[PDB]
Amino acid sequence: GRVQHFTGYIEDGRGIFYSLPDMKQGDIIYASMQNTGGNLDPLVGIMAEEIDPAVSLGQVLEKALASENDLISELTAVADRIFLGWDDDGGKGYSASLEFTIPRDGTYHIFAGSTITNQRLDKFQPTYTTGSFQLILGLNAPQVISGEGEPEGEVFASLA
Structure with a gap:
């Protein structure tokens, strides 16, 4: 197992990308993203080539939505289309x-951002956090998704 920690801050719907170069088929990537301050409701995803979720998620925010x-x-x-795998x-x-x-050898990218949620009692008008x-x-390193985050081994990811 190789585990590696990052700290970040989400403002203005600007998600953050992390590069996973030279992933090999059959490798298993585990990711956990926890709120460490503010009202942030995490959204974590993985993709092959870096595409921007801000465009398609921005379109979700304009839609007339009446309920959760x-x-x-x-x-x-939107997320099923944008990501190879995701969770909020x-x-x-x-x-x-x-x-x-990992389905094939190559460079992958992890996206860490905010999901879209409603925080108002006066109407259902969701926003980012x-x-x-x-x-x-x-x-x-399966211990990552059991809440055992201790860093170990050589680095395999960096800020993209």
Whole structure:
């Protein structure tokens, strides 16, 4: 197992990308992203080539949404398209975790950002959240998704 820690801050819907160069088929990536301050509801994803979720998620934010069921439907359609694998905290966990088996050799990217949730009692008008997080990445290190984040072995990821 190789485990590696990152700290970041989410403002203005600017998610952060992390590069995973030279991943090999069959490697398993584990990621956990926890809120460490502010109202941040984490969204963690993995993709092959770096694409920007801000564009498609921005379009979800404009939609006329009447309920959490409508939001889950739109968000899922977008996220399933954008990411090879993803997880959010359902607007309740403040922690998001993912397990992903690398399908082919290559460079992958982890995205750490905010999901979309409703925070108002006066209407259902969801928005992004803001705050700090700790992102734990594991390469064949399953202890990451059991809450055992201790860093170990050589680095395999960096800020993209």
